[PDB]
């Protein structure tokens, strides 16, 4: 029965997503801030896709890592084929949605991942950051302020709904994100930003003493 | 229920792993020391992957030997393609984890093996040795001091937790490793080191009269 198969796949993926750490991505004055709970030092849940496009994920590592590699390949191919500015986060989100909606229905086991695609405006340009959330089934939702993935998303989202403020500074945004994520030290936090003030490449990780000073 | 059948798969893999000998790899002053209980003289469980990367495994020989050959092929291809220093143990561990996850998910029988990838610093450079353990399901855990694989690892790990000491000499580390392994003679032990003092290639087997003098 297709109904039973869809229900089983949805419940399996939903139980696999919540069996993982939490990642929060929120927009601030300088762009988009990525905060992830990652005790590991080699495996990363935050990565760059293109010049102004970021990547965040939560779930089974070997699945969203492959998805990230595929997205990087697609972005580089599109950029070289036409131009760097012809690549947009919307196209990457659409490709991810198609890939996940095909895998959810065709493969034996659906991917237990939840993707986040964030895009900021180009240098010297004014535009509100765009946040896209792609689920296991293949649905894409546009979030204006913040995205919560992995673990118990509801308490963190509730805390963010009370503590969020637009055009906040990097330090205030980091404090808010950490406070919502606790509901942590530098040895278990993976922090990166999409700095819209950067000339070409906006992605920039914040680790070490620089991270320690901020929080 | 596929979920409960995955329990049978995990139990079969664990039974295969426990139905084998024990291998211990611990860091010392000169790098990483490998001590294995190998009664055979032709088959080996410790091998070199690249200039500064070792390999230790425990389980079914025909599986981790094939994995070792694949890792050697990947390391040599990467080294020739870009540079020798571009090859790192982190990439080898990631490749092993992805391959083992794919096999555990798709193949009829999971690989009943337990892998260990160790990397030391280059010559003239200071860095703490990195130890990685890769399980049958694809999980990789970073062990800072020592790794125990194969057989009943609980007593050996408990003994190592008490007897281990950082910056220990080769002789003291060998004594500690053998004492924890008992809880053997030169005719049933395979000993190799990742000597960080070596200029280019760190792997070096210690067998025969030199091994006898060491212990």
């Amino acid at each position: 029965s297709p109904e039973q198969a869809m229900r089983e796949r949805s419940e399996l993926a939903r139980k696999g997503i919540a069996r993982a750490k939490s990642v929060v991505a929120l927009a601030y004055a300088g762009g988009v801030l990525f905060v992830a709970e990652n005790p590991s030092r080699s495996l990363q849940k935050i990565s760059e896709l293109y010049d102004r496009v970021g990547f965040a994920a939560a779930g089974k590592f070997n699945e969203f890592d492959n998805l990230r590699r595929g997205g990087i390949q697609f972005a580089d191919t599109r950029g070289y084929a036409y131009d760097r500015r012809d690549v947009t986060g919307r196209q990457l989100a659409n490709v991810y949605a198609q890939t996940l909606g095909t895998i959810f229905t065709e493969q034996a086991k659906p991917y237990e991942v939840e993707l986040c695609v964030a895009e900021v405006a180009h240098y010297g340009e004014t535009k509100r950051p765009e946040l896209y959330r792609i689920t296991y089934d293949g649905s894409i939702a546009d979030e204006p302020h913040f995205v919560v993935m992995g673990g118990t998303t509801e308490p963190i989202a509730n805390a963010l709904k009370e503590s969020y403020a637009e055009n906040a500074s990097l330090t205030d945004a980091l404090r808010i994100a950490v406070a919502a994520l606790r509901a942590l030290g530098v040895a278990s936090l993976e922090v990166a930003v999409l700095d819209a003030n950067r000339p070409r490449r906006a992605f920039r990780r914040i680790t070490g003493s620089a991270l320690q000073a901020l929080l | 229920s596929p979920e409960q059948a995955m329990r049978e798969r995990s139990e079969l893999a664990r039974k295969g792993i426990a139905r084998a000998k024990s291998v211990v790899a611990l860091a010392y002053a000169g790098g990483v020391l490998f001590v294995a209980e190998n009664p055979s003289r032709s088959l080996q469980k410790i091998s070199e992957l690249y200039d500064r990367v070792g390999f230790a495994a425990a389980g079914k020989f025909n599986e981790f030997d094939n994995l070792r050959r694949g890792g050697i092929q990947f390391a040599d291809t990467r080294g020739y393609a870009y540079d020798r220093r571009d090859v790192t143990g982190r990439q080898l561990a990631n490749v092993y984890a992805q391959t083992l996850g794919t096999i555990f998910t798709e193949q009829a029988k999971p690989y009943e093996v337990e892998l260990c990838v160790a990397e030391v610093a280059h010559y003239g450079e200071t860095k703490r040795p990195e130890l990685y353990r890769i399980t049958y399901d694809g999980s990789i855990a970073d062990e800072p001091h020592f790794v125990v694989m194969g057989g009943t690892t609980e007593p050996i790990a408990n003994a190592l937790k008490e007897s281990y000491a950082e910056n220990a000499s080769l002789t003291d580390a060998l004594r500690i490793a053998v004492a924890a392994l008992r809880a053997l003679g030169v005719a049933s032990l395979e000993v190799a080191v990742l000597d960080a003092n070596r200029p280019r290639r760190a792997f070096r087997r210690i067998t025969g009269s030199a091994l006898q003098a060491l212990l």
Binding site: A20, S40, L43, K45, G59, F61, G150 | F104, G138
Partner: peptide, 5 residues
């Protein structure tokens, strides 16, 4: 299974 982040 294992390796969920």
């Amino acid at each position: 299974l294992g390796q969920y982040l």
